[PDB]
Design an enzyme around this catalytic site. Sequence first.
Site, PDB file in Angstrom:
ATOM      1  N   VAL A  16      -1.445   1.278 -40.069  1.00 37.14           N
ATOM      2  CA  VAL A  16      -2.275   0.068 -40.165  1.00 37.14           C
ATOM      3  C   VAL A  16      -1.718  -1.147 -39.384  1.00 37.14           C
ATOM      4  CG1 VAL A  16      -1.362  -0.821 -42.424  1.00 37.14           C
ATOM      5  CG2 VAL A  16      -3.783  -1.189 -41.830  1.00 37.14           C
ATOM      6  N   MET A  17      -0.413  -1.375 -39.505  1.00 42.26           N
ATOM      7  CA  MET A  17       0.232  -2.541 -38.924  1.00 42.26           C
ATOM      8  C   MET A  17       0.451  -2.385 -37.420  1.00 42.26           C
ATOM      9  SD  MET A  17       0.405  -4.743 -41.292  1.00 42.26           S
ATOM     10  CE  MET A  17       1.573  -6.018 -40.800  1.00 42.26           C
ATOM     11  N   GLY A  18       1.013  -1.247 -37.022  1.00 46.80           N
ATOM     12  CA  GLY A  18       1.325  -0.974 -35.626  1.00 46.80           C
ATOM     13  C   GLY A  18       0.101  -0.816 -34.752  1.00 46.80           C
TER      14      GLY A  18
ATOM     15  N   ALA B  83      10.210   1.481 -43.555  1.00 45.13           N
ATOM     16  CA  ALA B  83      11.543   0.935 -43.740  1.00 45.13           C
ATOM     17  C   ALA B  83      12.540   1.998 -44.214  1.00 45.13           C
ATOM     18  CB  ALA B  83      11.502  -0.259 -44.702  1.00 45.13           C
TER      19      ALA B  83
ATOM     20  N   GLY C 177      -0.864  -9.142 -43.177  1.00 44.07           N
ATOM     21  CA  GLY C 177      -1.538  -7.876 -43.469  1.00 44.07           C
ATOM     22  C   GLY C 177      -2.247  -7.279 -42.261  1.00 44.07           C
TER      23      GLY C 177
ATOM     24  N   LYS D 160      11.457 -13.136 -44.222  1.00 41.68           N
ATOM     25  CA  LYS D 160      10.324 -12.286 -44.617  1.00 41.68           C
ATOM     26  C   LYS D 160      10.453 -11.745 -46.046  1.00 41.68           C
ATOM     27  CE  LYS D 160       6.491 -10.226 -44.697  1.00 41.68           C
ATOM     28  NZ  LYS D 160       6.187  -8.845 -44.219  1.00 41.68           N
TER      29      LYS D 160
ATOM     30  N   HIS E  87       9.699 -14.567 -48.390  1.00 46.20           N
ATOM     31  CA  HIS E  87       8.250 -14.703 -48.265  1.00 46.20           C
ATOM     32  C   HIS E  87       7.556 -13.722 -49.232  1.00 46.20           C
ATOM     33  CE1 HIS E  87       4.513 -13.048 -46.678  1.00 46.20           C
ATOM     34  NE2 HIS E  87       4.271 -14.164 -46.011  1.00 46.20           N
ATOM     35  N   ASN E  88       7.968 -12.464 -49.198  1.00 46.78           N
ATOM     36  CA  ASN E  88       7.400 -11.479 -50.104  1.00 46.78           C
ATOM     37  C   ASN E  88       7.735 -11.710 -51.584  1.00 46.78           C
ATOM     38  OD1 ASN E  88       6.331 -10.421 -47.803  1.00 46.78           O
ATOM     39  ND2 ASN E  88       6.890  -8.302 -48.249  1.00 46.78           N
TER      40      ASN E  88
ATOM     41  N   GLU F 270       5.327 -14.353 -52.666  1.00 49.20           N
ATOM     42  CA  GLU F 270       4.093 -13.585 -52.760  1.00 49.20           C
ATOM     43  C   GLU F 270       3.922 -12.826 -54.091  1.00 49.20           C
ATOM     44  OE1 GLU F 270       3.014 -11.067 -49.253  1.00 49.20           O
ATOM     45  OE2 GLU F 270       3.202  -9.495 -50.777  1.00 49.20           O
ATOM     46  N   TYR F 271       4.921 -12.027 -54.470  1.00 48.99           N
ATOM     47  CA  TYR F 271       4.936 -11.356 -55.773  1.00 48.99           C
ATOM     48  C   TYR F 271       4.714 -12.356 -56.891  1.00 48.99           C
ATOM     49  CZ  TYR F 271       7.108  -6.832 -54.251  1.00 48.99           C
ATOM     50  OH  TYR F 271       7.413  -5.591 -53.720  1.00 48.99           O
TER      51      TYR F 271
ATOM     52  N   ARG G  15       5.516  -5.956 -62.595  1.00 46.65           N
ATOM     53  CA  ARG G  15       5.138  -4.729 -61.891  1.00 46.65           C
ATOM     54  C   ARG G  15       5.767  -3.498 -62.540  1.00 46.65           C
ATOM     55  NH1 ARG G  15       4.070  -5.510 -55.308  1.00 46.65           N
ATOM     56  NH2 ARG G  15       3.185  -7.621 -55.519  1.00 46.65           N
TER      57      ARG G  15
HETATM   58  N1  LIG Z   1      10.691  10.025 -42.296  1.00 45.13           N
HETATM   59  C1  LIG Z   1      10.159   9.467 -41.173  1.00 45.13           C
HETATM   60  N2  LIG Z   1      10.734   9.659 -39.957  1.00 45.13           N
HETATM   61  C2  LIG Z   1      10.202   9.106 -38.854  1.00 45.13           C
HETATM   62  N3  LIG Z   1       9.092   8.349 -38.927  1.00 45.13           N
HETATM   63  C3  LIG Z   1       8.470   8.119 -40.115  1.00 45.13           C
HETATM   64  C4  LIG Z   1       9.005   8.687 -41.261  1.00 45.13           C
HETATM   65  N4  LIG Z   1       8.228   8.316 -42.297  1.00 45.13           N
HETATM   66  C5  LIG Z   1       7.238   7.544 -41.810  1.00 45.13           C
HETATM   67  N5  LIG Z   1       7.379   7.419 -40.480  1.00 45.13           N
HETATM   68  C6  LIG Z   1       6.459   6.637 -39.608  1.00 45.13           C
HETATM   69  O1  LIG Z   1       6.369   5.266 -40.071  1.00 45.13           O
HETATM   70  C7  LIG Z   1       5.137   5.101 -40.772  1.00 45.13           C
HETATM   71  C8  LIG Z   1       4.686   3.659 -40.933  1.00 45.13           C
HETATM   72  O2  LIG Z   1       3.538   3.657 -41.782  1.00 45.13           O
HETATM   73  P1  LIG Z   1       3.612   3.766 -43.395  1.00 45.13           P
HETATM   74  O3  LIG Z   1       4.238   5.088 -43.785  1.00 45.13           O
HETATM   75  O4  LIG Z   1       4.164   2.459 -43.921  1.00 45.13           O
HETATM   76  O5  LIG Z   1       2.053   3.841 -43.795  1.00 45.13           O
HETATM   77  P2  LIG Z   1       1.036   5.090 -43.817  1.00 45.13           P
HETATM   78  O6  LIG Z   1       1.238   5.689 -45.195  1.00 45.13           O
HETATM   79  O7  LIG Z   1      -0.317   4.457 -43.597  1.00 45.13           O
HETATM   80  O8  LIG Z   1       1.492   5.978 -42.682  1.00 45.13           O
HETATM   81  C9  LIG Z   1       4.171   5.995 -40.018  1.00 45.13           C
HETATM   82  O9  LIG Z   1       3.779   5.423 -38.760  1.00 45.13           O
HETATM   83  C10 LIG Z   1       5.045   7.204 -39.787  1.00 45.13           C
HETATM   84  O10 LIG Z   1       4.579   8.059 -38.755  1.00 45.13           O
HETATM   85  P3  LIG Z   1       3.620   9.283 -39.192  1.00 45.13           P
HETATM   86  O11 LIG Z   1       2.204   8.846 -38.896  1.00 45.13           O
HETATM   87  O12 LIG Z   1       4.120  10.390 -38.307  1.00 45.13           O
HETATM   88  O13 LIG Z   1       3.882   9.446 -40.670  1.00 45.13           O
HETATM   89  O1  LIG Z   2       5.013  -7.373 -46.229  1.00 40.17           O
HETATM   90  C1  LIG Z   2       3.872  -7.029 -46.519  1.00 40.17           C
HETATM   91  N1  LIG Z   2       2.851  -7.876 -46.524  1.00 40.17           N
HETATM   92  O2  LIG Z   2       3.082  -9.250 -46.477  1.00 40.17           O
HETATM   93  C2  LIG Z   2       3.580  -5.605 -46.919  1.00 40.17           C
HETATM   94  O3  LIG Z   2       2.193  -5.373 -47.215  1.00 40.17           O
HETATM   95  C3  LIG Z   2       4.405  -5.257 -48.149  1.00 40.17           C
HETATM   96  O4  LIG Z   2       4.284  -3.853 -48.363  1.00 40.17           O
HETATM   97  C4  LIG Z   2       3.903  -6.000 -49.381  1.00 40.17           C
HETATM   98  O5  LIG Z   2       4.848  -5.826 -50.427  1.00 40.17           O
HETATM   99  P1  LIG Z   2       4.708  -4.651 -51.521  1.00 40.17           P
HETATM  100  O6  LIG Z   2       4.094  -3.443 -50.830  1.00 40.17           O
HETATM  101  O7  LIG Z   2       6.127  -4.480 -51.988  1.00 40.17           O
HETATM  102  O8  LIG Z   2       3.783  -5.214 -52.576  1.00 40.17           O
END
Ligand SMILES: Nc1ncnc2c1ncn2[C@@H]1O[C@@H](COP(=O)(O)OP(=O)(O)O)[C@@H](O)[C@H]1OP(=O)(O)O
Ligand SMILES: O=C(NO)[C@H](O)[C@H](O)COP(=O)(O)O
Lengths: 471, 469
Positions: B13-15, B76, B130, B184, B187-188, B191-192, B289
């Site tokens: 979604v973000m990338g 992350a 977002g 950041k 910031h989050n 937000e929470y 939460r």
């Molecule tokens: N263990 C891992 N090693 C390398 N890349 C990873 C990974 N886990 C997630 N990613 C990448 O980092 C992710 C970032 O998105 P996300 O996991 O936060 O959201 P979503 O659930 O929508 O994919 C994905 O782009 C993912 O690539 P894939 O589409 O191949 O899953």
């Molecule tokens: O940094 C963000 N938005 O500001 C991301 O959506 C982040 O996942 C939001 O925090 P959360 O998923 O821990 O609720």
Amino acid sequence: HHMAQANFGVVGMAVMGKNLALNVESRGYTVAIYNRTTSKTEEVFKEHQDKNLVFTKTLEEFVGSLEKPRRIMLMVQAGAATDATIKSLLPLLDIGDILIDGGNTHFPDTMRRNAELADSGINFIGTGVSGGEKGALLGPSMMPGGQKEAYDLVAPIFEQIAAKAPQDGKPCVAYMGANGAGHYVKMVHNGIEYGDMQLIAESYDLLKRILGLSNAEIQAIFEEWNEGELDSYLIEITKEVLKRKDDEGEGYIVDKILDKAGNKGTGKWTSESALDLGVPLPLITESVFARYISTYKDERVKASKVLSGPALDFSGDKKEVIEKIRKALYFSKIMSYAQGFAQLRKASEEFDWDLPYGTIAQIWRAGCIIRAEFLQNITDAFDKDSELENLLLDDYFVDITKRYQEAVRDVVSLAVQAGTPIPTFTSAISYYDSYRSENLPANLIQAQRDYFGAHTYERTDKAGIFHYDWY
Amino acid sequence: MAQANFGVVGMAVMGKNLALNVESRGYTVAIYNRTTSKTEEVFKEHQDKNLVFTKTLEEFVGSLEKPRRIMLMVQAGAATDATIKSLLPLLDIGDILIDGGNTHFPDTMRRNAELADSGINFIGTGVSGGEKGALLGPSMMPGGQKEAYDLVAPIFEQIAAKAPQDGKPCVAYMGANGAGHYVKMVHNGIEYGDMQLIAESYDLLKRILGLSNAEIQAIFEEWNEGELDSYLIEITKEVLKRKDDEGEGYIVDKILDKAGNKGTGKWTSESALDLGVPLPLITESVFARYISTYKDERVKASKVLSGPALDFSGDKKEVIEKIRKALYFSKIMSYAQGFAQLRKASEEFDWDLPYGTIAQIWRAGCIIRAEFLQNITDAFDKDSELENLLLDDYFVDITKRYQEAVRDVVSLAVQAGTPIPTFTSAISYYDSYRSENLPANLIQAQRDYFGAHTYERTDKAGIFHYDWY
Ligand SMILES: Nc1ncnc2c1ncn2[C@@H]1O[C@@H](COP(=O)(O)OP(=O)(O)O)[C@@H](O)[C@H]1OP(=O)(O)O
Ligand SMILES: O=C(NO)[C@H](O)[C@H](O)COP(=O)(O)O
Ligand SMILES: Nc1ncnc2c1ncn2[C@@H]1O[C@@H](COP(=O)(O)OP(=O)(O)O)[C@@H](O)[C@H]1OP(=O)(O)O
Ligand SMILES: [Cl-]
Ligand SMILES: [Cl-]
């Protein structure tokens, strides 16, 4: 010289280790003593010439003086100093030897040390030791974790030196579980302590500020409270400090003590584990933040001059309100322990420890600062059902909360309208009201996260992961 | 293939949206994702856009013009670590690597130190706003070498949200190494805190005042027209409009009350505990939460534990307004704590964080966009060393006028049995912060009594121990 003549050894001749060594010796053992700075060992040996202490000068001599399997208790500065001491002992030890760490150690360090030493055939017992310096000498509450078979060889000495519960004489020590289980339980004890101290601080603050009660009046109220279900050592200390004159002026020492709560360091540990584990631990955490905000004294003095609040005069019934604060205190204490034992439950699942919850409450009955009569009701709860998820669901606690919650609500209304800060009392009632809510407004939070972040949600009516099209 | 001016790794979604943002500014943009089919979708769905489809990392790197600019929008932790590890050997001196994920700041600090003399420019940046923020204009919080920042500043400014007030890009240099990711995180945290306060307000309106979703929708809508004007209040009134996509009624009512989290709010509280910073409101919202995830226990407990079953008999309009006042007051408490944390973190890590600038770049493209952000900047302009927002005239006034209503809302909610962990934490913090004397003197006495921990005195300098025996 004294090769293999000592039954047990202590490293660290600062007061704690010294006292522990004297405690073990007094139970009819020969005890090898060692300290990095030799003069301190020499001083202990000289002042206790009639005791069966073996004075050792080097680690090699120390290790040589001990019967096998060697039982060696480390009472040295936590962190790097303990690892350096472990590292110094390791070459000299034999397979099957038992190292014991009695410091206030962060449990991951114990888990790491335990795993590393096991590769060398060395047993490692991380042990929480409560009661401070007097407890070390006379009878501590102890929380050992490590290899069970090695611990069984240590247990008889621990059971002898440990504090004995005044109600039945049972030793305040038991096996907690593998690796870091013992230091984990000790950590939670220390978090709980922080909570109990803040709850009493809030009670004292309400009596002082809202009811206008004098130190002598407040002393008498705590005394009376301590004759009932609240019966606890911390309340005893509280009424003792309230008696005391200032040693450097008129009035009371308690009124001359600057309101900046001590130390930082290790007090955050319980809260940090709760955050790591996804455990709700708001009461103990408010108690930590309450200490932190007291350290911001200068800012508070400035803020007191610019920020407004109520200037109420209390007109209600003093006696009625004193009793209501008594109820709020016990209720809120129950909230903190419920949260703390729930954290132990999660930690036990996470680390595969099978923590003995009822026994934990039993070994806290003496030789530690949180000792209190109601620990028995916690034990009864787990005796009745060892899989009890939360103390609040046990019949005894259900009754208390039912009967006491109205008082808490009144106390919260009164203090908040008056402007007296009660972070833990308010957190207590919020936890009670959250935990018993079948539905919480976290459905809205989930909607918001899906809206901006597409984090997805679960539904109330069917299985699966869902994402809504908000745009 | 060196056609591309900028590269994005991570096609979630973000990338995806960031890539499209960059492309809209008149660039050709390389796109990569570990799962190739995801890259294929966005390439295929946007054939009119200047995107370069790549399937391997060597191809991705190859497709970029040197010095390369690569931004990572990856999960992350280990995901991000492995991606950077795979990527580094493919890179050249002068190349710029940007971690735009919600990376825990210590990871970034370590990364920065490790890469300090590699010749590879590293920026760890927070990105807010977002999915639509990423597409149309995010708030950005970059840290790293100032020299590295200067290299990406022009393009960061182009993609960034612009403040409606003055047109200023919602991006600035935060400071060395992990400063940007730390900002950041805070910031989050904030937000929470606000999200939990909003949920409590909604809970009060629904349970105590018995209001319907349309009624609450209208209330938040009116609130958003006043000083509560914010992103979170705006999206709340949007959420409450929506009907179920798989049945009858409102979608919000069909969402299981089990709040997820991806670590940032937790990390904020952890840092506050580490730094000695009182952060009760944000921390309470994290625990709120956590307790929502205990759904099965709460269902059991609701059948066993008793509480008030009272019926509100008062004036609804008056109480709605008191909740409004209280929500604004408590929102302020959350920010005041967040900024107090930032001040302590800046001192600890020697970042010289620009507090006033931080508030400015939060004015748009930002989940925590609030109307009083300028007053936050005004406060720091006046006093760069301002210890707490509550000490500024603007905030003194609000708390003075609104504190009464907060006490009424807390009292009403507590008597009714409606859980308000953050509303109660808000008034507690306010009453603690303004107390010249707290009962910590008694705690200090207990500690000296039991463990000879020593104390300071009110009347003279030095440290003392009392002979209690
Ligand atoms: N263990 C891992 N090693 C390398 N890349 C990873 C990974 N886990 C997630 N990613 C990448 O980092 C992710 C970032 O998105 P996300 O996991 O936060 O959201 P979503 O659930 O929508 O994919 C994905 O782009 C993912 O690539 P894939 O589409 O191949 O899953
Ligand atoms: O940094 C963000 N938005 O500001 C991301 O959506 C982040 O996942 C939001 O925090 P959360 O998923 O821990 O609720
Ligand atoms: N780096 C180190 N290596 C080995 N032992 C150490 C050590 N640092 C501290 N200790 C021991 O651990 C100390 C006790 O731990 P502590 O720091 O908690 O004590 P206290 O509470 O009295 O300050 C001392 O026994 C010390 O030995 P010395 O008497 O020689 O100082
Ligand atoms: Cl083990
Ligand atoms: Cl203790």
